[PDB]
């Protein structure tokens, strides 16, 4: 066998933030890998007509202070993703241009139906620990339900549901039908609320990595040399003897003190344990999908958007729209001009039978219509992703809880397992589904492991992150009005109690 | 390498009968098994205080013919659960004994109420074909409901809400909130019907295998021999060369023309594959967990409840109660007696935190409560298993669909990959989830490989079976006002 402190199973942000911090603590880590790369969940194609370009996860944001300080001391620079011009919101076949993060509502009655949505969902999302979500007063009554339900409980007008809908899609790769309303809430308040997970400037959509995402895992590679084991994959962990035994596909054994699952919850399925799992963990690890996502970036000759004062954004409503959101992927310099769009939840099972250029086609068409542009039917080069296809990932962006599960199963997520410490971003309390859940879960299990063999003090498993100072985070503010406008229902019982 | 002409991954009731329906053709099969044992999601433990008892599948009835024929082959005879005496169903702390399968109603709004109930679930039964759920003309609008929300607009009653919520809990050990309406109502009409499910005298609770239902996967591989393989779990599979390579945790590499997968859904999770499996299958087997249970046996020294005229059977509503349903478990000659519970769902894993004694006490102290005797507090012997702590089986008794999979991923789950044909209960057309759905399904992709072999046609792949002669079924028959009185929103129309 190959003897170290921790075998770290997985080389994505996690495994990789686990293995560094182990490393610079003075331990011998090796990182097991499945595939023949780094990066898992973040990849960054480069090629001469693209130069590079994330097909995974790429964005970054204010309060996202873990991932910028890991990527700041592997020397890395982030810039701020086009939101110059107007966005636009695309419903019922028109488009409606405007500025700031949520599209305005005229009609009176609607915009009372979706000032009360978001303030809602924020409120309900207060009730919520971050680090212990099935501890909520109504935990068992909102994992009861779906999305679907609470939505169709809340909206009071077609419109609001619409958007709603496309919030859920967007944020989670799934249907509304699909996902516990309690994980959804969860989801969303663990991000910082409404407002900032849907935001480019000021949110999570605000910067990318000049280079793509995929060098914090490469530079994490470079620093720790052959300790990365490429193709790799783990398929057995025997725990019944003195050290930890890990086994991988291509027939090498590994002999560690402690292991860090660093891979999606389910992914853990791939591994035959001995002794078996724990009932909890056992059942759990069949229980949690990830969503349903084809990264598209469709490139042109020139920005051309921003001539007629579109910045690239495009939230776009309809069955028949193979994209419901878009954003600017134009480099900093101005060249390599692009449309990046997610084609989301049924859609990517859905139009995955297409060919490449069959979809490039649909996203073309889309495009000309919204943009109201015949140069979006002039491509000049096309890249995609369908994370419905990776063995090693199971789909993107992150891990989703059908109803019933999060109160059930969720207290076993991070839950060790003898010498088994669990990363990986499904575990993280802050930006869990992001690259900063990545780092803040493969730091906080390295750092369980580290209190483990007695090198800190408990009161250090859990650290906080100061603000970047690159990345300065704006407060989240409402106005009076957004505070203390009635809901639909809560406007009828006013008119009941005039009129009566 | 060991060459064969075909590996079976897994040796329960469906892996079995692929195997032996292979090798009775002349085909030089393989079955690779990942425990120390045959049967997977059927277990019988023999020991001299219970002589055996099933500690996973055990029920057979009317309509089940495949695994009546494959039984009766391999030289096993069945005996009928004890349903002569009254059945309980434990309303408000009080016990009611009844007769007949559905638990009676006297109140005329809350009979409405379940009248309305039990027959809406055949109605709408009888529009979702069983080979294509997702061919139902609503198919979409009921798979984005859970069975929860179905049964909130349903029912009018509590008392309506909360028997519809027993019923899910025990057909598919799940919470109403965990699936899909779709899937459910699927699952009850391809056991034909709700009558049928729920029924022990002509239904699927009506019999038991003498010597316990293990003997089905024991006796099979009796006639494979050393064909068998214990202790080897598939890690992987590859279908890049002429002949597909298997791959067991213990180090030893099997060749064969074509592979049936035998296991859960779910458990294909455990093998990697190359090349990579279609995404579509690559999620399914993401999304579609087993159920949680249970199951309990409680012996006594006589089988007390019949001097009651009670036959064993309690259907117990509530929170507080560890058990929803229970059959009597005594042999055929009225010894070993004994009460089978199942603790269903979220009490699975509520209880499992509890030590065996102390599951032991409250099993006997609600006996005591509902059969109204002392003499449950007198337990001789007990017998359980928490099939949630099995690696590979994933829960008990199958694979439930949770709101919007059985639409999006349901038409996977037996599209072959290259040379991987699917067998298991999950993908049977006919009683899926029991012994007879393994059956059917291990037989359909046996077939499936001997058309791929151009040894029978297409139509040989799905074969019709006789009607069993020891187990004939007798028709399901509803009386005119079953069939038309009004629901209760029907009621409130007329006013
Ligand atoms: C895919 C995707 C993700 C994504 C996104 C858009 C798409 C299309 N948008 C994001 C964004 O703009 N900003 C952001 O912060 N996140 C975004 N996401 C999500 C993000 O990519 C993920 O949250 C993050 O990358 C997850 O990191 P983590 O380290 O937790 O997980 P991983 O990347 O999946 O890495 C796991 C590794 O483990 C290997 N593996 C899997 N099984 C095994 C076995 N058995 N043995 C050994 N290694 C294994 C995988 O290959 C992977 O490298
Ligand atoms: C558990 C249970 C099931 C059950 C029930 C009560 C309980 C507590 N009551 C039933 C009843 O009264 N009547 C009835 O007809 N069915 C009842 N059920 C369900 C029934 O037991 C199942 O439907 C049936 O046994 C399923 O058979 P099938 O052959 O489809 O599946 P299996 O038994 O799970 O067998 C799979 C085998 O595969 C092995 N395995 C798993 N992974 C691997 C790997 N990687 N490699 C090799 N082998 C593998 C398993 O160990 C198992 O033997
Ligand atoms: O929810 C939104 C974006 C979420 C988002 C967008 C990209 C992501 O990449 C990984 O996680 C991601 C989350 C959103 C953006 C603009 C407008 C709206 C609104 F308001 F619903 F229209 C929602
Ligand atoms: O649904 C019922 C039984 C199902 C059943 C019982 C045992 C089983 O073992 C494997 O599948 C099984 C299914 C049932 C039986 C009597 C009454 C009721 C009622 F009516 F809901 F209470 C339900
Ligand atoms: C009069 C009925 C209008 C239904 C409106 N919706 C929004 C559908 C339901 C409100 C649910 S709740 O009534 O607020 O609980
Ligand atoms: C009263 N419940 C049964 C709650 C709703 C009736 C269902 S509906 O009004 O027919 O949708």
């Given at each position: 066998?190959?003897?170290?402190?921790?075998?770290?199973?997985?080389?994505?942000?996690?495994?990789?933030?686990?293995?560094?911090?182990?490393?610079?603590?003075?331990?011998?880590?090796?990182?097991?890998?499945?595939?023949?790369?780094?990066?898992?969940?973040?990849?960054?194609?480069?090629?001469?007509?693209?130069?590079?370009?994330?097909?995974?996860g790429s964005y970054v944001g204010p309060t996202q202070n873990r991932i910028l300080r890991l990527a700041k001391?592997?020397?890395?620079?982030?810039?701020?993703?086009?939101?110059?011009?107007?966005?636009?919101?695309?419903?019922?076949?028109?488009?409606?241009?405007?500025?700031?993060?949520?599209?305005?509502?005229?009609?009176?009655?609607?915009?009372?139906?979706?000032?009360?949505?978001?303030?809602?969902?924020?409120?309900?999302?207060?009730?919520?620990?971050?680090?212990?979500?099935?501890?909520?007063?109504?935990?068992?009554?909102?994992?009861?339900?779906?999305?679907?339900?609470?939505?169709?409980?809340?909206?009071?007008?077609?419109?609001?549901?619409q958007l709603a809908t496309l919030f859920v899609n967007l944020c989670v790769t799934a249907e509304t039908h699909?996902?516990?309303?309690?994980?959804?809430?969860?989801?969303?308040?663990?991000?910082?609320?409404?407002?900032?997970?849907?935001?480019?400037?000021?949110?999570?959509?605000?910067?990318?990595?000049?280079?793509?995402?995929?060098?914090?895992?490469?530079?994490?590679?470079?620093?720790?040399?052959?300790?990365?084991?490429?193709?790799?994959?783990?398929?057995?962990?025997?725990?019944?003897?003195?050290?930890?035994?890990?086994?991988?596909?291509?027939?090498?054994?590994?002999?560690?003190?402690?292991?860090?699952?660093?891979?999606?919850?389910?992914?853990?399925?791939?591994?035959?344990?001995?002794?078996?799992?724990?009932?909890?963990?056992?059942?759990?690890?069949?229980?949690?999908?990830?969503?349903?996502?084809?990264?598209?970036?469709?490139?042109?000759?020139?920005?051309?958007?921003?001539?007629?004062?579109?910045?690239?954004?495009?939230?776009?409503?309809?069955?028949?729209?193979?994209?419901?959101?878009?954003?600017?992927?134009?480099?900093?310099?101005?060249?390599?001009?692009?449309?990046?769009?997610?084609?989301?939840?049924?859609?990517?099972?859905?139009?995955?039978?297409?060919?490449?250029?069959?979809?490039?086609?649909?996203?073309?068409?889309?495009?000309?219509?919204?943009?109201?542009?015949?140069?979006?039917?002039?491509?000049?080069?096309?890249?995609?992703?369908?994370?419905?296809?990776?063995?090693?990932?199971?789909?993107?962006?992150?891990?989703?809880?059908?109803?019933?599960?999060?109160?059930?199963?969720?207290?076993?997520?991070?839950?060790?397992?003898?010498?088994?410490?669990?990363?990986?971003?499904?575990?993280?309390?802050?930006?869990?589904?992001?690259?900063?859940?990545?780092?803040?879960?493969?730091?906080?299990?390295?750092?369980?492991?580290?209190?483990?063999?007695?090198?800190?003090?408990?009161?250090?498993?859990?650290?906080?992150?100061?603000?970047?100072?690159?990345?300065?985070?704006?407060?989240?503010?409402?106005?009076?009005?957004?505070?203390?406008?009635?809901?639909?229902?809560?406007?009828?019982?006013?008119?009941?109690?005039?009129?009566?």
């Open positions: 066998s190959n003897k170290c402190d921790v075998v770290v199973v997985g080389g994505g942000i996690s495994g990789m933030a686990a293995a560094k911090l182990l490393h610079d603590s003075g331990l011998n880590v090796v990182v097991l890998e499945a595939r023949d790369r780094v990066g898992g969940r973040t990849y960054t194609l480069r090629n001469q007509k693209v130069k590079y370009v994330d097909l995974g001391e592997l020397g890395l620079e982030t810039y701020k993703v086009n939101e110059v011009e107007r966005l636009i919101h695309h419903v019922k076949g028109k488009s409606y241009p405007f500025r700031g993060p949520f599209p305005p509502v005229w009609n009176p009655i609607t915009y009372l139906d979706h000032n009360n949505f978001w303030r809602t969902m924020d409120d309900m999302g207060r009730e919520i620990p971050s680090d212990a979500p099935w501890k909520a007063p109504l935990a068992e009554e909102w994992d009861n339900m779906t999305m679907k339900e609470l939505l169709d409980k809340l909206c009071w007008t077609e419109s609001a549901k699909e996902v516990s309303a309690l994980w959804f809430l969860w989801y969303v308040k663990q991000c910082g609320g409404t407002t900032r997970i849907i935001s480019t400037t000021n949110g999570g959509q605000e910067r990318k990595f000049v280079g793509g995402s995929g060098q914090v895992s490469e530079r994490i590679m470079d620093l720790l040399g052959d300790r990365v084991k490429l193709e790799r994959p783990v398929i057995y962990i025997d725990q019944t003897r003195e050290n930890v035994l890990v086994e991988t596909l291509n027939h090498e054994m590994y002999e560690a003190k402690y292991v860090i699952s660093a891979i999606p919850p389910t992914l853990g399925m791939k591994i035959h344990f001995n002794p078996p799992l724990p009932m909890m963990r056992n059942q759990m690890i069949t229980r949690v999908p990830l969503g349903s996502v084809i990264k598209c970036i469709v490139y042109y000759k020139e920005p051309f958007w921003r001539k007629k004062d579109y910045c690239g954004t495009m939230i776009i409503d309809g069955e028949e729209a193979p994209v419901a959101y878009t954003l600017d992927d134009t480099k900093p310099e101005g060249n390599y001009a692009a449309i990046m769009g997610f084609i989301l939840a049924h859609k990517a099972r859905k139009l995955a039978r297409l060919t490449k250029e069959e979809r490039l086609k649909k996203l073309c068409e889309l495009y000309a219509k919204v943009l109201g542009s015949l140069e979006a039917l002039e491509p000049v080069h096309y890249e995609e992703k369908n994370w419905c296809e990776e063995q090693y990932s199971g789909g993107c962006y992150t891990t989703y809880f059908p109803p019933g599960i999060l109160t059930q199963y969720g207290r076993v997520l991070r839950q060790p397992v003898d010498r088994i410490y669990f990363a990986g971003t499904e575990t993280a309390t802050h930006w869990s589904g992001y690259m900063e859940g990545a780092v803040e879960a493969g730091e906080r299990a390295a750092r369980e492991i580290l209190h483990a063999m007695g090198k800190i003090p408990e009161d250090e498993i859990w650290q906080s992150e100061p603000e970047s100072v690159d990345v300065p985070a704006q407060p989240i503010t409402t106005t009076f009005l957004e505070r203390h406008l009635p809901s639909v229902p809560g406007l009828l019982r006013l008119i009941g109690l005039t009129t009566i």
